[PDB]
Amino acid sequence: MEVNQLGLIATALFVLVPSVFLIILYVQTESQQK
Amino acid sequence: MEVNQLGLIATALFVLVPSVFLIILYVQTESQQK
Amino acid sequence: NPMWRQGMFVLPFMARLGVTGSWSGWSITGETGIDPGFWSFEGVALAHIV
Amino acid sequence: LNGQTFTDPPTVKSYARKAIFGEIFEFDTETLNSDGIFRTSPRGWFTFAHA
Amino acid sequence: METLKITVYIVVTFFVLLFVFGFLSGDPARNPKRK
Amino acid sequence: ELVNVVDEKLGTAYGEKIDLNNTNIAAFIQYRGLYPTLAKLIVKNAPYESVEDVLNIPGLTERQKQILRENLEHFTVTEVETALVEGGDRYNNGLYK
Amino acid sequence: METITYVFIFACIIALFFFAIFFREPPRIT
Amino acid sequence: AELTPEVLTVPLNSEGKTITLTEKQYLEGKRLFQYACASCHVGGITKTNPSLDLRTETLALATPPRDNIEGLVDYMKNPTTYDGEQEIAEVHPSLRSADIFPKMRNLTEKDLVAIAGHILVEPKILGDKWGGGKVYY
Amino acid sequence: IPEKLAFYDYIGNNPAKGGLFRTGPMNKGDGIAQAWKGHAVFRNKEGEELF
Amino acid sequence: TLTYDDIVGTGLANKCPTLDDTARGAYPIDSSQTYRIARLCLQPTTFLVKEEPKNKRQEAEFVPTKLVTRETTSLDQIQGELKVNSDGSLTFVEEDGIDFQPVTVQMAGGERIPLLFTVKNLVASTQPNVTSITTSTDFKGEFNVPSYRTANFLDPKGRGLASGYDSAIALPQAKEEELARANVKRFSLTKGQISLNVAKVDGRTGEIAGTFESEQLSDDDMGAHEPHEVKIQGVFYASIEPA
Amino acid sequence: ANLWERFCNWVTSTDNRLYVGWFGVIMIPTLLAATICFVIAFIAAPPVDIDGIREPVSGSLLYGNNIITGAVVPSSNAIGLHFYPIWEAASLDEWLYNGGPYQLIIFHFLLGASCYMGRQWELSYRLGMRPWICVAYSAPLASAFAVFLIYPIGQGSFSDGMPLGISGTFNFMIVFQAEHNILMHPFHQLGVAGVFGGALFCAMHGSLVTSSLIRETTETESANYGYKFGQEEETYNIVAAHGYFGRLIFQYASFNNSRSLHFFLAAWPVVGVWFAALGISTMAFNLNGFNFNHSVIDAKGNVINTWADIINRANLGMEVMHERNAHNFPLDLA
Ligand code: CLA
Ligand code: CLA
Ligand code: CLA
Ligand code: CLA
Ligand SMILES: CC(C)=CCC/C(C)=C/CC/C(C)=C/CC/C(C)=C/CC/C(C)=C/CC/C(C)=C/CC/C(C)=C/CC/C(C)=C/CC/C(C)=C/CC1=CC(=O)C(C)=C(C)C1=O
Ligand SMILES: CCCCCCCCCCCCCCCC(=O)OC[C@H](CO[C@@H]1O[C@H](CS(=O)(=O)O)[C@@H](O)[C@H](O)[C@H]1O)OC(=O)CCCCCCCCCCCCCCC
Ligand SMILES: CCCCCCCCCCCCCCCC(=O)OC[C@H](CO[C@@H]1O[C@H](CS(=O)(=O)O)[C@@H](O)[C@H](O)[C@H]1O)OC(=O)CCCCCCCCCCCCCCC
Ligand code: HEC
Ligand SMILES: CCCCCCCCCCCCO[C@@H]1O[C@H](CO)[C@@H](O[C@H]2O[C@H](CO)[C@@H](O)[C@H](O)[C@H]2O)[C@H](O)[C@H]1O
Ligand SMILES: CCCCCCCS[C@@H]1O[C@H](CO)[C@@H](O)[C@H](O)[C@H]1O
Ligand SMILES: CCCCCCCS[C@@H]1O[C@H](CO)[C@@H](O)[C@H](O)[C@H]1O
Ligand SMILES: CCCCCCCS[C@@H]1O[C@H](CO)[C@@H](O)[C@H](O)[C@H]1O
Ligand code: OEX
Ligand SMILES: [Ca+2]
Ligand SMILES: [Ca+2]
Ligand SMILES: [Cl-]
Ligand SMILES: [Cl-]
């Protein structure tokens, strides 16, 4: 299939960037003095 | 230039995956009790 | 093959207000041998980066 | 090409250039958009990774 | 090009003059011990 | 089919003998008596329709003519090739040792 | 796309220089 | 392999007469060729005119023939172009232009023979390297 | 007729003919325009002009 | 009187000599006397290149270009026979001289156009009955434009005509057909045309000066691409002498 | 005080986050100019006729290079050593074709880096320090001067200066080998000893200090926390380190004096690299590596090759191919 050659990078960054934002926030919440 | 089409995604993840690993670890260190 | 056939988005905004020339010598109306001075498309870009 | 003889020097030279590689083969270079530059096999890749 | 040259000449002269007068402005004294 | 004209020429008599119309001047060192005096005249007076025309160069000594006669069998003529005669290349073709 | 990638990495490195100098962990005596 | 009397036996003249050079003469020929000639003819080529070399086969086809002691000695007194047609003493070192090529001023007849003997002997030792240029280094 | 005037009278330049995920320049679809072919007049066997 | 050290680095060495405004004279030609041009000089002042439009039906124009190889463009010390023909026209037959200069000019947008600016093997003639060369004399003629690179020139991958590889050696198993035009070097030889318009004559010294316009093809990179059409304009100077 | 006096006080302030100083007054603008011109040329400059034969070489990213192949290309051989500022050109287009950016960058960079060296002296004096860190930096600086200025002067052209690029650098190395036999030059050999020995003593010192750090932390913490910035006590046991190293080799081969040890650490690479720099700077005037080509001859006079002759054959390959359209006469004399 002749897919758009930027579809892979677009999907990967679409997933990675916001997911990493949430992981950063979650882990630094867990490490806060409980 | 006829570059390898996977060059872009290989380069992107090479930077992003370990940079985000480090950022996650830095931020949760800062958020630990002063 | 004008700008709007080529997916240009900012180039028309530069042209709308009078930036029509490149330092490389061409104008968007198709002229050769122009001296746009500093305020070419490139000068506008550089000014925004600075 | 069994039974064929070529005498045109550019053609003879072309085949001589392939003969430096040993036996001469016809390849489909289109299906994979092949670039004409040699790669190693799994024998080479395995040996590199393991060493 | 003429304007550019004159501009650069001025710029360079300006900075060279800072360097020379600067080092003339009691440089040995500008240290933490004996002045 | 696009063709390299210098390679094609190597398949003619140019590939076998001194081509009075094309060969660089250092090639005249291969035979007794030709260089530099006759070599200079022969290149200066080219092209020639046949090898014998080389004897028609003006001002030749009788000894000079006999040396040519003795060497005609080592000469040929082929059509002038622009790629071999431009750039002063008959006098210096960028090859030394 | 490659020019963009190379210049992007370079720009990140210059930014990194800026934070590493002006937003370093300040050295504190003892 | 050795530098034998046979290796040192070279043509004296156009008529097939030979001369056997001594080892002292061989040494002397190398020394004097280095002294007066090698700045242009190192390894049997010619730096200022690469079309002409010092190979024996090239010397044989020179006019007069230079592939013998007599022809080489005469070349060093009165050098000519390859066809024998012009005298080039004014631009090539010779005994007759020792005024403008001062290194020729104290070369004796004996020295010229030694240098000529070096030119004929060296290719018997070095083969195609003599007069070969960088390809054969 | 100026080529530029003819080119406006062509639907591949109409901005209501695209798609949300058909990305990039218009030239990526129909191509980089090179030349007007000229005005086509259609006629039937009777010679009547048809549109 | 100017010496090398007066001139060096000024740009004047690339300028042809000029004649005074008083030089509006007439130089007699004796049809029984033989003559030569002892020195022809051509100083280009404008290079124009014909654009190559996307369609026929509009003729392309010659457009201005920017010179990027500095003051290295003039033809000079050119000489040859000036024949008096049996209708009184003169024909100049170029023999030798600094009769070419490689030149690179740049189109708007940056495309570089190298050419061999030249009058090699020039044969140019006047109108009939030139009893004197005057401000009304013109020369028109043709010249040869050999390949801008000569046959030893090797491209960046080592390929050439009289030397070099004959294939793309970095792509050992690529099909050769698609690369034929880049692999097989070709040496062009095409014709150019020039007109010289006399504007000044010193009847007493044999000197003339004027304007020229030539047309020729640019570099085709040994057959790798199509050449452009170039139009060169400038001033010329020539000294005519009995010989 | 007056404006000038306050200005001087600011320029020379020990309190600025980055020290300025009088050397800095020249260094700042010149380094900024070289950096900006370099970055813009490396991205966007068109091809440059390095060898003056109308054969332009593409250095920049937008014209088909990557980080490894890209360069700012040296100025044209037609220019030679002539000074080619922007205002000497008819246009920026001509300036670009002829490799103007190279001259602009390297002249500003050399001036700026020489001022960096002065500035190191300057601050050391403001801080009441001993003054010779700037002498250690003279070694890399000398080396930059050798490849960007001395070598071009010797050879008569900035087109033979080292290109500002990764592959260009290797081009310069390989051509330098063909032309000077640098590997066979003892000053380059001392440079190798300087940099290989500098690496060696760097690893040695790192490992000896690290090996004798005093226990101040638990197994969960990085030992680096066992040192506090500005503490008075030394953080490792040098007598322990000397005890180890003196036994590895023999007692008197090891330093127990830290001052002598650190002097050696400075001196070895700095001296070796000064000889590296002087190697390039004297091969600039064609005093070249040892030549033992055909040095070994048998009883008849046959040449008996040595490894030197095999080097020679590799050198010949470099020589005959380099700048393949630029030589018309048989000797490459510069
Ligand atoms: C006002 C914004 C705007 C507009 C109108 C344009 C317009 C244009 N650009 Mg420019 N551009 C922009 C901003 C814009 N750009 C920005 C911010 C960048 C940096 C990323 C660019 C970088 C850029 C490049 C690199 C290129 C263009 C090109 C173009 C042309 C083709 C556009 C196209 O294919 O879109 C396609 C649009 C889409 C496929 C729509 C995306 C819809 C998103 C993905 C929806 C996401 C939904 C969301 C996740 C839902 C969340 C739900 C939750 C809340 C519950 C067109 C002239 C192209 C061109 O021809 O240049 C010459 C080209 O190559 N642009
Ligand atoms: C510290 C500031 C500084 C210095 C030292 C330089 C230096 C230089 N520039 Mg750069 N420049 C600068 C800032 C500077 N620039 C800035 C801020 C810009 C942006 C506008 C530029 C833009 C620029 C361009 C566009 C160009 C240069 C070029 C040059 C070179 C030619 C300069 C010249 O011809 O001056 C001549 C002027 C003098 C000789 C004046 C000196 C007079 C004093 C008063 C006498 C004493 C000086 C004497 C020599 C000894 C010094 C004292 C010492 C012993 C302590 C030179 C490497 C050119 C280039 O690099 O060419 C390849 C070039 O094209 N510069
Ligand atoms: C077993 C491998 C080996 C050895 C023993 C050497 C040895 C040497 N190399 Mg080579 N080299 C090697 C592998 C080796 N090399 C490899 C794999 C490469 C890459 C292909 C190189 C590339 C290389 C280059 C390009 C050069 C050398 C040079 C040298 C010399 C100086 C090295 C130096 O200062 O290092 C740093 C180390 C020290 C400063 C520690 C001291 C090392 C010395 C030599 C040991 C002395 C001990 C002593 C003799 C033993 C007796 C002691 C007794 C009293 C108890 C030295 C002769 C240079 C040379 O040829 O100079 C003539 C030179 O230019 N090397
Ligand atoms: C193992 C094999 C080997 C080894 C170990 C070496 C080792 C060396 N070679 Mg030799 N070389 C080799 C093989 C080898 N070579 C071969 C095979 C060839 C032939 C192909 C050569 C041909 C050769 C040449 C032609 C040269 C060398 C040079 C060198 C030295 C390079 C390091 C240097 O110059 O430091 C000196 C330090 C510098 C040059 C750094 C200057 C830094 C400036 C002052 C500041 C720059 C700041 C920067 C732009 C921005 C920084 C970041 C910013 C954010 C602040 C070093 C001794 C070079 C040398 O001797 O130079 C003098 C040299 O020119 N080699
Ligand atoms: C089967 C059989 C027969 C078995 C028998 C075996 C047997 C029992 C044998 C016994 C008999 C016997 C011993 C025989 C000997 C055989 C023999 C001669 C073998 C050869 C050995 C050999 C080739 C050795 C190589 C020589 C060698 C190691 C040379 C070293 C050269 C060298 C550069 C030394 C360094 C000197 C120096 C100036 C060092 C300073 C640089 C440095 C390390 C800085 C870092 C540093 C240093 C400090 O100093 C401290 C403090 C700190 C902090 C620190 O940073
Ligand atoms: C394409 C062309 C366009 C290019 C334009 C570039 C020029 C832009 C200049 C704009 C001014 C803003 C800059 C401030 C940054 C700063 O340093 O602040 C930090 C401190 C605080 O400033 C301090 O300022 C203080 C006041 S306050 O704190 O800011 O209020 C004061 O207390 C103190 O004395 C003073 O030192 O400034 C200083 O340390 C003193 C000046 C240091 C000089 C820095 C420049 C050195 C450049 C090095 C060159 C290397 C080349 C590049 C390598 C990648
Ligand atoms: C053949 C005929 C002879 C002719 C001679 C030829 C002339 C050339 C010889 C030059 C003389 C050198 C003497 C220098 C002594 C010295 O440096 O004193 C300074 C200190 C004092 O030593 C320290 O001495 C101290 C006491 S005191 O300072 O000396 O008072 C003591 O505290 C300490 O432990 C001790 O290490 O010496 C040391 O620190 C030890 C290391 C010395 C060796 C390195 C320095 C030289 C440069 C490195 C070599 C680079 C070469 C490699 C290139 C890649
Ligand atoms: C350079 C300055 C030279 C020096 C020193 C010597 N020779 Fe030479 N040689 C040189 C040239 C340019 C030529 C060709 C001259 C020409 O136009 O023909 C020569 C030629 C010879 C020859 C003839 C070669 C042949 O026939 O194949 C000989 C025998 C010769 N040279 C010998 C020779 C000797 C013995 C020298 C030292 C005393 C000497 N040459 C010096 C240039 C130079
Ligand atoms: C192109 C090169 C220019 C050539 C200039 C030739 C210089 C030779 C004449 C020197 C005259 C300058 O004289 C010198 O000037 C400076 C600047 O005003 C003075 O002034 C300085 O005094 C003190 C000294 O501690 C400083 O702290 C203070 O910042 C400054 O005002 C010096 O004390 C004075 O000695
Ligand atoms: C940081 C970039 C500084 C370079 C500025 C170059 C100015 S260039 C200058 O500009 C004038 C005003 O626009 C024009 O009228 C004039 O023709 C032009 O020569
Ligand atoms: C003048 C060239 C024609 C003669 C045939 C060439 C040798 S054989 C030739 O080699 C190619 C690689 O170059 C293969 O891709 C191809 O399949 C094969 O036909
Ligand atoms: C902010 C710095 C801008 C750098 C400007 C690059 C030169 S300007 C550039 O030149 C190209 C080649 O001539 C042209 O094709 C192009 O149209 C033009 O944008
Ligand atoms: O330019 Mn760069 O490199 Ca020093 O040598 Mn000569 O010149 Mn070129 O050949 Mn080899
Ligand atoms: Ca393909
Ligand atoms: Ca007229
Ligand atoms: Cl090269
Ligand atoms: Cl040369």
PDB file of C-alpha atoms in Angstrom, chain K residues 57-201:
ATOM      1  CA  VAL K  57      32.226  22.131  -4.332  1.00  0.00           C
ATOM      2  CA  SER K  58      28.964  21.911  -2.361  1.00  0.00           C
ATOM      3  CA  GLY K  59      29.490  22.326   1.404  1.00  0.00           C
ATOM      4  CA  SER K  60      26.082  23.181   2.802  1.00  0.00           C
ATOM      5  CA  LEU K  61      23.113  21.144   4.097  1.00  0.00           C
ATOM      6  CA  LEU K  62      20.547  22.659   1.731  1.00  0.00           C
ATOM      7  CA  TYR K  63      22.768  21.935  -1.241  1.00  0.00           C
ATOM      8  CA  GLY K  64      22.911  18.173  -0.702  1.00  0.00           C
ATOM      9  CA  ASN K  65      25.179  17.581   2.329  1.00  0.00           C
ATOM     10  CA  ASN K  66      24.763  15.908   5.648  1.00  0.00           C
ATOM     11  CA  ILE K  67      26.528  16.714   8.963  1.00  0.00           C
ATOM     12  CA  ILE K  68      29.469  14.454   8.012  1.00  0.00           C
ATOM     13  CA  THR K  69      29.952  15.645   4.367  1.00  0.00           C
ATOM     14  CA  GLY K  70      29.067  19.386   5.015  1.00  0.00           C
ATOM     15  CA  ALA K  71      31.652  22.084   5.294  1.00  0.00           C
ATOM     16  CA  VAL K  72      32.284  25.756   4.879  1.00  0.00           C
ATOM     17  CA  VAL K  73      34.652  25.406   1.868  1.00  0.00           C
ATOM     18  CA  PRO K  74      37.975  27.246   1.646  1.00  0.00           C
ATOM     19  CA  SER K  75      38.358  30.370  -0.570  1.00  0.00           C
ATOM     20  CA  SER K  76      39.348  30.061  -4.198  1.00  0.00           C
ATOM     21  CA  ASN K  77      42.876  29.227  -5.332  1.00  0.00           C
ATOM     22  CA  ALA K  78      42.535  32.277  -7.667  1.00  0.00           C
ATOM     23  CA  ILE K  79      42.442  34.438  -4.606  1.00  0.00           C
ATOM     24  CA  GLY K  80      45.537  32.822  -3.079  1.00  0.00           C
ATOM     25  CA  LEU K  81      46.530  34.763   0.037  1.00  0.00           C
ATOM     26  CA  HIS K  82      44.710  37.948  -1.155  1.00  0.00           C
ATOM     27  CA  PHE K  83      42.415  39.456   1.436  1.00  0.00           C
ATOM     28  CA  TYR K  84      38.837  38.851   0.268  1.00  0.00           C
ATOM     29  CA  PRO K  85      36.340  40.736   2.557  1.00  0.00           C
ATOM     30  CA  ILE K  86      32.751  41.097   1.499  1.00  0.00           C
ATOM     31  CA  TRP K  87      33.349  44.615   0.147  1.00  0.00           C
ATOM     32  CA  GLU K  88      36.046  43.392  -2.258  1.00  0.00           C
ATOM     33  CA  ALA K  89      33.319  41.424  -4.137  1.00  0.00           C
ATOM     34  CA  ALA K  90      31.008  42.860  -6.803  1.00  0.00           C
ATOM     35  CA  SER K  91      28.050  41.076  -5.163  1.00  0.00           C
ATOM     36  CA  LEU K  92      27.221  38.626  -2.382  1.00  0.00           C
ATOM     37  CA  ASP K  93      26.683  36.118  -5.199  1.00  0.00           C
ATOM     38  CA  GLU K  94      30.323  36.490  -6.316  1.00  0.00           C
ATOM     39  CA  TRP K  95      31.520  36.510  -2.693  1.00  0.00           C
ATOM     40  CA  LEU K  96      29.741  33.206  -2.116  1.00  0.00           C
ATOM     41  CA  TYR K  97      31.057  31.537  -5.327  1.00  0.00           C
ATOM     42  CA  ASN K  98      34.660  32.429  -4.338  1.00  0.00           C
ATOM     43  CA  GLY K  99      34.474  31.224  -0.718  1.00  0.00           C
ATOM     44  CA  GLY K 100      34.340  34.524   1.041  1.00  0.00           C
ATOM     45  CA  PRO K 101      32.624  33.082   4.116  1.00  0.00           C
ATOM     46  CA  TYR K 102      35.660  30.861   4.824  1.00  0.00           C
ATOM     47  CA  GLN K 103      37.983  33.927   5.164  1.00  0.00           C
ATOM     48  CA  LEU K 104      35.500  35.861   7.237  1.00  0.00           C
ATOM     49  CA  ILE K 105      34.995  32.957   9.589  1.00  0.00           C
ATOM     50  CA  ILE K 106      38.594  31.932  10.030  1.00  0.00           C
ATOM     51  CA  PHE K 107      39.949  35.480  10.515  1.00  0.00           C
ATOM     52  CA  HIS K 108      37.292  36.302  13.121  1.00  0.00           C
ATOM     53  CA  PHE K 109      37.733  32.906  14.750  1.00  0.00           C
ATOM     54  CA  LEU K 110      41.572  33.123  15.032  1.00  0.00           C
ATOM     55  CA  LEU K 111      41.369  36.652  16.475  1.00  0.00           C
ATOM     56  CA  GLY K 112      38.601  35.637  18.871  1.00  0.00           C
ATOM     57  CA  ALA K 113      40.366  32.448  20.032  1.00  0.00           C
ATOM     58  CA  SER K 114      43.641  34.390  20.590  1.00  0.00           C
ATOM     59  CA  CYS K 115      41.565  36.751  22.731  1.00  0.00           C
ATOM     60  CA  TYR K 116      40.054  33.754  24.486  1.00  0.00           C
ATOM     61  CA  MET K 117      43.615  32.864  25.444  1.00  0.00           C
ATOM     62  CA  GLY K 118      44.366  36.435  26.663  1.00  0.00           C
ATOM     63  CA  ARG K 119      41.091  36.422  28.608  1.00  0.00           C
ATOM     64  CA  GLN K 120      42.197  33.294  30.443  1.00  0.00           C
ATOM     65  CA  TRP K 121      45.305  35.161  31.627  1.00  0.00           C
ATOM     66  CA  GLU K 122      43.117  38.173  32.495  1.00  0.00           C
ATOM     67  CA  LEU K 123      40.651  36.405  34.731  1.00  0.00           C
ATOM     68  CA  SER K 124      43.398  34.447  36.483  1.00  0.00           C
ATOM     69  CA  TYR K 125      44.979  37.784  37.475  1.00  0.00           C
ATOM     70  CA  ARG K 126      41.566  39.203  38.652  1.00  0.00           C
ATOM     71  CA  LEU K 127      41.082  36.104  40.815  1.00  0.00           C
ATOM     72  CA  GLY K 128      44.615  36.091  42.379  1.00  0.00           C
ATOM     73  CA  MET K 129      45.392  32.814  40.580  1.00  0.00           C
ATOM     74  CA  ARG K 130      48.678  31.666  39.059  1.00  0.00           C
ATOM     75  CA  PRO K 131      48.647  32.572  35.372  1.00  0.00           C
ATOM     76  CA  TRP K 132      49.503  29.604  33.116  1.00  0.00           C
ATOM     77  CA  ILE K 133      46.177  27.938  32.184  1.00  0.00           C
ATOM     78  CA  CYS K 134      46.437  30.248  29.141  1.00  0.00           C
ATOM     79  CA  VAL K 135      49.777  28.608  28.228  1.00  0.00           C
ATOM     80  CA  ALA K 136      48.074  25.162  28.233  1.00  0.00           C
ATOM     81  CA  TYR K 137      45.411  26.546  25.804  1.00  0.00           C
ATOM     82  CA  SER K 138      48.216  27.862  23.530  1.00  0.00           C
ATOM     83  CA  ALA K 139      48.658  24.276  22.363  1.00  0.00           C
ATOM     84  CA  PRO K 140      45.239  23.786  20.759  1.00  0.00           C
ATOM     85  CA  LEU K 141      45.295  27.409  19.649  1.00  0.00           C
ATOM     86  CA  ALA K 142      48.727  27.002  17.939  1.00  0.00           C
ATOM     87  CA  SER K 143      47.281  23.973  16.137  1.00  0.00           C
ATOM     88  CA  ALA K 144      44.297  25.939  14.853  1.00  0.00           C
ATOM     89  CA  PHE K 145      46.650  28.695  13.648  1.00  0.00           C
ATOM     90  CA  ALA K 146      48.805  26.052  11.897  1.00  0.00           C
ATOM     91  CA  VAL K 147      45.961  24.592   9.805  1.00  0.00           C
ATOM     92  CA  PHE K 148      43.957  27.783   9.115  1.00  0.00           C
ATOM     93  CA  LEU K 149      46.764  30.368   8.684  1.00  0.00           C
ATOM     94  CA  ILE K 150      50.405  29.116   8.669  1.00  0.00           C
ATOM     95  CA  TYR K 151      49.896  26.272   6.249  1.00  0.00           C
ATOM     96  CA  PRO K 152      47.965  28.456   3.740  1.00  0.00           C
ATOM     97  CA  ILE K 153      50.719  31.124   4.017  1.00  0.00           C
ATOM     98  CA  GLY K 154      53.497  28.575   3.315  1.00  0.00           C
ATOM     99  CA  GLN K 155      51.654  27.129   0.351  1.00  0.00           C
ATOM    100  CA  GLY K 156      50.486  30.520  -0.963  1.00  0.00           C
ATOM    101  CA  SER K 157      46.685  29.993  -0.667  1.00  0.00           C
ATOM    102  CA  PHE K 158      43.785  29.780   1.713  1.00  0.00           C
ATOM    103  CA  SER K 159      42.401  27.166  -0.642  1.00  0.00           C
ATOM    104  CA  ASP K 160      44.893  24.864   1.106  1.00  0.00           C
ATOM    105  CA  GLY K 161      43.614  25.820   4.586  1.00  0.00           C
ATOM    106  CA  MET K 162      41.725  23.051   6.479  1.00  0.00           C
ATOM    107  CA  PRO K 163      38.038  23.115   5.438  1.00  0.00           C
ATOM    108  CA  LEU K 164      35.484  23.853   8.187  1.00  0.00           C
ATOM    109  CA  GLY K 165      33.802  20.500   8.016  1.00  0.00           C
ATOM    110  CA  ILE K 166      34.156  16.862   9.052  1.00  0.00           C
ATOM    111  CA  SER K 167      34.884  15.242   5.638  1.00  0.00           C
ATOM    112  CA  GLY K 168      36.807  18.357   4.613  1.00  0.00           C
ATOM    113  CA  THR K 169      39.083  17.755   7.581  1.00  0.00           C
ATOM    114  CA  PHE K 170      39.851  14.225   6.372  1.00  0.00           C
ATOM    115  CA  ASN K 171      40.489  15.571   2.848  1.00  0.00           C
ATOM    116  CA  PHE K 172      43.087  17.967   4.314  1.00  0.00           C
ATOM    117  CA  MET K 173      44.713  15.037   6.286  1.00  0.00           C
ATOM    118  CA  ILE K 174      44.973  12.730   3.268  1.00  0.00           C
ATOM    119  CA  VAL K 175      46.336  15.398   0.878  1.00  0.00           C
ATOM    120  CA  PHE K 176      48.767  16.477   3.659  1.00  0.00           C
ATOM    121  CA  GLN K 177      50.027  12.863   3.824  1.00  0.00           C
ATOM    122  CA  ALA K 178      50.610  12.711   0.027  1.00  0.00           C
ATOM    123  CA  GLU K 179      52.416  16.068   0.067  1.00  0.00           C
ATOM    124  CA  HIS K 180      54.485  15.894   3.281  1.00  0.00           C
ATOM    125  CA  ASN K 181      54.547  12.326   4.462  1.00  0.00           C
ATOM    126  CA  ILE K 182      53.408  13.624   7.839  1.00  0.00           C
ATOM    127  CA  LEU K 183      53.210  10.215   9.440  1.00  0.00           C
ATOM    128  CA  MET K 184      57.000   9.920   8.954  1.00  0.00           C
ATOM    129  CA  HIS K 185      57.570  13.345  10.589  1.00  0.00           C
ATOM    130  CA  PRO K 186      58.876  13.208  14.148  1.00  0.00           C
ATOM    131  CA  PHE K 187      56.862  16.263  15.275  1.00  0.00           C
ATOM    132  CA  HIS K 188      53.609  14.550  14.268  1.00  0.00           C
ATOM    133  CA  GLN K 189      54.917  11.426  16.004  1.00  0.00           C
ATOM    134  CA  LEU K 190      55.477  13.496  19.124  1.00  0.00           C
ATOM    135  CA  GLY K 191      51.919  14.867  18.706  1.00  0.00           C
ATOM    136  CA  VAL K 192      50.608  11.234  18.638  1.00  0.00           C
ATOM    137  CA  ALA K 193      52.625  10.515  21.773  1.00  0.00           C
ATOM    138  CA  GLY K 194      51.143  13.698  23.221  1.00  0.00           C
ATOM    139  CA  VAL K 195      47.502  12.801  22.489  1.00  0.00           C
ATOM    140  CA  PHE K 196      47.687   9.003  23.054  1.00  0.00           C
ATOM    141  CA  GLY K 197      49.736   9.666  26.263  1.00  0.00           C
ATOM    142  CA  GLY K 198      47.323  12.457  27.312  1.00  0.00           C
ATOM    143  CA  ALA K 199      44.436   9.937  26.916  1.00  0.00           C
ATOM    144  CA  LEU K 200      46.436   7.317  28.741  1.00  0.00           C
ATOM    145  CA  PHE K 201      47.385   9.633  31.687  1.00  0.00           C
TER     146      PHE K 201
END
